[PDB]
């Protein structure tokens, strides 16, 4: 069993397949003698659904507050609705339906009626009822129940795939790692997982049919294997591997306070990519100099509804303050990739990653763009904040966004609300357009950050979440690495600088190149900070610059890798 | 009603709605009277299914021959198999399911049984079974079945969307045009419609909800308006609008033979993109000097099976010969973005346009690449052909494919099979990767054709299919133009040439820029040949260079549109 290394670590744990068992309704009519057993089946499965809910309601009386409780209390009501035991019981008795057939039809009726009124609030109950519907049915049906937030024991997730949203809400005290059939190194799912410090392997093809619930697994995400029901002998070897990983952390932690300077005096900034306030420890721990990218999406995901200016402002305030004196590049919201914000019901697209994403959504719905930009400016009252925009392709877009920034700024001035007047405004360069037009853009913004995840996806036209072509996904191709050069240069030509938060900035393989190409700031998963700090400290910039120039002249990846390879053999 | 004009023309006819209708199975047990009913309901639902295939089968021993007719003979056989009649009947009668729920089950049953055996041949029979399940189930549930190839009367098609294959199967004598909710100017479906000279308007809000089956429309794909049940004095205005349209042809016609030479002596080629020998007619009609892109996919969607070496050869030979002295640029096959061929049953992808497309397939399944290249080469013994590859992303890919050609060349040599030893090989530059490494690629090929539909798509990360963001799909961006220039220049630096088969070549607004930027070859829908020829014949080339240069420095489309306009004002 072998996939793509996604997020590092070794994990020892029982398998939990997130793959939910299908609701198979028994459709054979029942007999008069059965009528009692079936009533009791439903009453039994209900009490069991009502159980799980009481223990999700008390959980949300804590880890979510005292309002999240009411939400789940309202659910319990929907389940224990006397219109339901009414209709359901009558279906079993009067039409000899299975308790599961009955539940299925009473629920559907209940939900369908609720929508058939012209109400947004009743349109929500119908979803609630259908979701309570499932819980009940699956409880009646005997099927297992999987609670991502409320996992009980230390497990390793095995699924076909995982959404960043799903990955968000994962209980960390309990999930030790995950493995998926599909995905790729550079999915937002894999990316997130890196800052959750959660080991993950993703391109497995078919883990979901090589692994069964409760198989003991060692997710070796150092050497890219999973072992299913391993011998004690294998476990022990894997425990030595686990320990060896810790020794490295220890040796590498010696770099924590050291700056990222090359042997010849060239300093670059080494920052962390974050998603949430909590990722900041990771950052402190790994010697971050600040935050090169704050993916605000992960906020919008962290919840069940669209965060207000108020709540965002609280959240960006906390991150700023949690970064003490250190700066933060807050990127405005990038939803629409492989980043579902489900609670919105944006319609399906044939190509989400070539779709209505990030900047395109906010510009379609100023409401969304206004709250956010407002929330960030108001929060730049309490920290050194920069603003950055995802998914820029045109100068036109940048200009429009600046207008908005200036409009929100006035509104703030007008309402006696403080913001850092000197706030720097930058643009992601993650689009072959933005790279092509970089000279121009460098004139309109304060800085760049290269998103090599998207730039690669788009340059090479390969979907970053698509295992089948992943061998074509090559951020280290002459294609992408020359676009990267262009961007960096365009920036310096205008006295501006370029960061990188794409996963390449964290890849040991790229550091010398990136370094020699004039990259100004490396933002990465906190875990990758020390190792990259290491190569930077053991590198001579001027030699890196000569190397990067011959590597980028190479016509194929291997010819290019080769140059890098020889250099590293000669230097070591 | 308006959307995005896709294919020019004005059609008059009754609406034919294309039913999205998705099969809903009635799982609820039926009552005991409903039995004779549903039994017969199945048999007749099937009689219909059987009937509709019966025309399709005979239209096959005509348009193709006995071997492609026998395909459906088998389909019929699988449909009429009494092993499924018996099973279906049993579940209606004994287990009291609807005709559809039984039929759903028995189909799924037979299909999974076939897959369970480890036989490529039966996995194919599986698919057929499922294919014919669909038709059976749609007939059982009386959902309408429009066989695009056997449309009775002159209609105008109205549909959610329309896939290239679908468009391929349109009875050209009876469908006079179409209108869809979704789509883009540059979607392959749109493009095919141009060579069929089929007026089309895509990307309306909701023509589906606004047009009734059998409404009288005047689809005006000249001015971008659809009239629903037009007033007779509107039926008149339009009829006169159609007159102007016809005179426009008559006038443009006069250039049929004239070369594409600017006033000051600069010549370019101007050719037709084609799909099928049948398009050669339009090309000759519109003064094409050769074929700049022979989208071989289209030939593949002209059939219900993968065309073998021999079928391809014949098809290519015909084209080569229907082109007389003229050169055809045969592109190897490009399946897998918005152009699937259903008969391949490839699996779904999250982003087809960033997925396993074109060359990525032929390289993962050599039989496909081999048959085809074999066929092209052999056809080159019969007329001037060139080979060109789609979706090229790296120098790696090109070398691997040339190496492939060389192998296939020898085999032909060894089998006593002529091929043009002079045969030139080039590549689509339609990826920002390709554009970026254009210099490198130019050493490795004889020529380039820039696919701006794709290049635009990836450079801007905007899906050619996605109407919601169509406003961002701008091949006339400073970003795409720059990349165009960079490619042309690459060509010229090696002493090769670049053509263009993307829709920009045919776009009146790019013609002066494309020209000024030194593009050697334009290839388009045949219908665009005269407009562009006209523009070319009436420009001064030197002036265009100056224009091009200016345009390439603009950071904004608008600013670049201005140049173009002041030119047109001052210069003819
Ligand atoms: O957003 C990013 O970090 C990227 O696309 O690489
Ligand atoms: O294939 C093409 O011609 C394109 O993408 O423009
Ligand atoms: Mg990105
Ligand atoms: Mg193309």
PDB file of C-alpha atoms in Angstrom, chain A residues 27-29 105 349-356 360 391 393 395-397 399 431-433 436-437 440 457-463 466 468-469 472 478-479 482-483 553-559, chain B residues 27-29 161 347 349-356 360 391 393 395-397 399 431-433 436-437 440 457-463 466 468-469 472 478-479 482-483 553-558:
ATOM      1  CA  UNK A  27     -38.959  -3.117   1.330  1.00  0.00           C
ATOM      2  CA  UNK A  28     -40.703  -6.448   2.069  1.00  0.00           C
ATOM      3  CA  UNK A  29     -44.061  -5.664   3.757  1.00  0.00           C
ATOM      4  CA  UNK A 105     -41.119   8.111   4.143  1.00  0.00           C
ATOM      5  CA  UNK A 349     -18.921  23.569 -11.715  1.00  0.00           C
ATOM      6  CA  UNK A 350     -17.348  21.336 -14.348  1.00  0.00           C
ATOM      7  CA  UNK A 351     -13.946  22.667 -13.351  1.00  0.00           C
ATOM      8  CA  UNK A 352     -13.963  24.163  -9.850  1.00  0.00           C
ATOM      9  CA  UNK A 353     -10.273  25.006 -10.111  1.00  0.00           C
ATOM     10  CA  UNK A 354     -10.947  26.948 -13.266  1.00  0.00           C
ATOM     11  CA  UNK A 355     -14.191  28.267 -11.748  1.00  0.00           C
ATOM     12  CA  UNK A 356     -15.872  30.838  -9.552  1.00  0.00           C
ATOM     13  CA  UNK A 360     -14.248  36.154  -8.334  1.00  0.00           C
ATOM     14  CA  UNK A 391      -6.345  34.188  -7.759  1.00  0.00           C
ATOM     15  CA  UNK A 393      -5.136  37.329 -13.220  1.00  0.00           C
ATOM     16  CA  UNK A 395      -4.297  44.441 -13.421  1.00  0.00           C
ATOM     17  CA  UNK A 396      -7.952  45.431 -13.787  1.00  0.00           C
ATOM     18  CA  UNK A 397      -8.822  43.136 -10.862  1.00  0.00           C
ATOM     19  CA  UNK A 399      -7.309  48.210  -9.465  1.00  0.00           C
ATOM     20  CA  UNK A 431      -1.751  32.343 -12.087  1.00  0.00           C
ATOM     21  CA  UNK A 432       0.205  32.111 -15.340  1.00  0.00           C
ATOM     22  CA  UNK A 433      -1.534  35.355 -16.215  1.00  0.00           C
ATOM     23  CA  UNK A 436       2.997  36.995 -17.338  1.00  0.00           C
ATOM     24  CA  UNK A 437       1.809  40.472 -16.290  1.00  0.00           C
ATOM     25  CA  UNK A 440       2.648  45.567 -14.496  1.00  0.00           C
ATOM     26  CA  UNK A 457      -1.715  23.514 -11.675  1.00  0.00           C
ATOM     27  CA  UNK A 458      -2.449  26.178 -14.227  1.00  0.00           C
ATOM     28  CA  UNK A 459       0.832  26.396 -16.142  1.00  0.00           C
ATOM     29  CA  UNK A 460       0.939  22.603 -16.605  1.00  0.00           C
ATOM     30  CA  UNK A 461      -2.799  22.318 -16.810  1.00  0.00           C
ATOM     31  CA  UNK A 462      -2.784  19.555 -14.218  1.00  0.00           C
ATOM     32  CA  UNK A 463      -5.282  19.309 -11.452  1.00  0.00           C
ATOM     33  CA  UNK A 466      -5.814  14.255  -9.459  1.00  0.00           C
ATOM     34  CA  UNK A 468      -3.794   9.800 -12.132  1.00  0.00           C
ATOM     35  CA  UNK A 469      -1.771  12.572 -13.676  1.00  0.00           C
ATOM     36  CA  UNK A 472       2.764  15.446 -14.565  1.00  0.00           C
ATOM     37  CA  UNK A 478      11.624  24.595 -16.460  1.00  0.00           C
ATOM     38  CA  UNK A 479       8.071  25.960 -17.164  1.00  0.00           C
ATOM     39  CA  UNK A 482      11.070  30.287 -15.205  1.00  0.00           C
ATOM     40  CA  UNK A 483       7.643  31.876 -14.457  1.00  0.00           C
ATOM     41  CA  UNK A 553      18.117  27.209 -18.764  1.00  0.00           C
ATOM     42  CA  UNK A 554      17.686  23.439 -18.804  1.00  0.00           C
ATOM     43  CA  UNK A 555      14.960  22.082 -21.097  1.00  0.00           C
ATOM     44  CA  UNK A 556      13.738  19.133 -18.997  1.00  0.00           C
ATOM     45  CA  UNK A 557      13.124  18.581 -15.291  1.00  0.00           C
ATOM     46  CA  UNK A 558      15.830  15.866 -14.987  1.00  0.00           C
ATOM     47  CA  UNK A 559      18.494  17.921 -16.722  1.00  0.00           C
TER      48      UNK A 559
ATOM     49  CA  UNK B  27     -38.848   1.828  -5.121  1.00  0.00           C
ATOM     50  CA  UNK B  28     -42.167   1.683  -3.211  1.00  0.00           C
ATOM     51  CA  UNK B  29     -43.882  -1.688  -3.573  1.00  0.00           C
ATOM     52  CA  UNK B 161     -25.922  22.403 -22.359  1.00  0.00           C
ATOM     53  CA  UNK B 347     -13.926   7.660 -15.314  1.00  0.00           C
ATOM     54  CA  UNK B 349     -12.630  13.793 -13.064  1.00  0.00           C
ATOM     55  CA  UNK B 350     -12.937  16.677 -10.711  1.00  0.00           C
ATOM     56  CA  UNK B 351     -11.505  19.049 -13.369  1.00  0.00           C
ATOM     57  CA  UNK B 352     -11.631  17.470 -16.769  1.00  0.00           C
ATOM     58  CA  UNK B 353      -9.896  20.491 -18.286  1.00  0.00           C
ATOM     59  CA  UNK B 354      -6.967  20.020 -15.931  1.00  0.00           C
ATOM     60  CA  UNK B 355      -7.183  16.247 -16.202  1.00  0.00           C
ATOM     61  CA  UNK B 356      -6.300  13.219 -18.221  1.00  0.00           C
ATOM     62  CA  UNK B 360      -1.955  12.146 -21.563  1.00  0.00           C
ATOM     63  CA  UNK B 391      -1.840  19.572 -24.709  1.00  0.00           C
ATOM     64  CA  UNK B 393       3.445  20.764 -21.529  1.00  0.00           C
ATOM     65  CA  UNK B 395      10.081  19.088 -23.743  1.00  0.00           C
ATOM     66  CA  UNK B 396       9.938  15.645 -22.099  1.00  0.00           C
ATOM     67  CA  UNK B 397       6.543  14.928 -23.718  1.00  0.00           C
ATOM     68  CA  UNK B 399      10.786  13.830 -27.229  1.00  0.00           C
ATOM     69  CA  UNK B 431      -0.569  25.484 -22.384  1.00  0.00           C
ATOM     70  CA  UNK B 432       1.245  28.335 -20.508  1.00  0.00           C
ATOM     71  CA  UNK B 433       3.947  25.746 -19.908  1.00  0.00           C
ATOM     72  CA  UNK B 436       7.000  29.463 -21.435  1.00  0.00           C
ATOM     73  CA  UNK B 437       9.417  26.919 -22.864  1.00  0.00           C
ATOM     74  CA  UNK B 440      13.154  24.915 -26.003  1.00  0.00           C
ATOM     75  CA  UNK B 457      -8.229  29.012 -20.194  1.00  0.00           C
ATOM     76  CA  UNK B 458      -5.074  28.102 -18.286  1.00  0.00           C
ATOM     77  CA  UNK B 459      -3.405  31.409 -18.321  1.00  0.00           C
ATOM     78  CA  UNK B 460      -6.507  33.034 -16.846  1.00  0.00           C
ATOM     79  CA  UNK B 461      -7.752  29.906 -15.042  1.00  0.00           C
ATOM     80  CA  UNK B 462     -11.151  30.410 -16.538  1.00  0.00           C
ATOM     81  CA  UNK B 463     -13.106  27.441 -17.728  1.00  0.00           C
ATOM     82  CA  UNK B 466     -18.256  28.404 -17.390  1.00  0.00           C
ATOM     83  CA  UNK B 468     -20.744  32.537 -14.731  1.00  0.00           C
ATOM     84  CA  UNK B 469     -17.183  33.793 -15.213  1.00  0.00           C
ATOM     85  CA  UNK B 472     -13.003  36.923 -17.354  1.00  0.00           C
ATOM     86  CA  UNK B 478      -2.051  41.625 -22.062  1.00  0.00           C
ATOM     87  CA  UNK B 479      -1.264  38.235 -20.508  1.00  0.00           C
ATOM     88  CA  UNK B 482       2.392  38.482 -24.488  1.00  0.00           C
ATOM     89  CA  UNK B 483       2.506  34.685 -24.355  1.00  0.00           C
ATOM     90  CA  UNK B 553       2.842  47.148 -23.554  1.00  0.00           C
ATOM     91  CA  UNK B 554      -0.676  47.917 -22.267  1.00  0.00           C
ATOM     92  CA  UNK B 555      -1.377  46.633 -18.732  1.00  0.00           C
ATOM     93  CA  UNK B 556      -5.093  46.621 -19.471  1.00  0.00           C
ATOM     94  CA  UNK B 557      -7.392  45.084 -22.103  1.00  0.00           C
ATOM     95  CA  UNK B 558      -9.393  48.245 -22.437  1.00  0.00           C
TER      96      UNK B 558
END
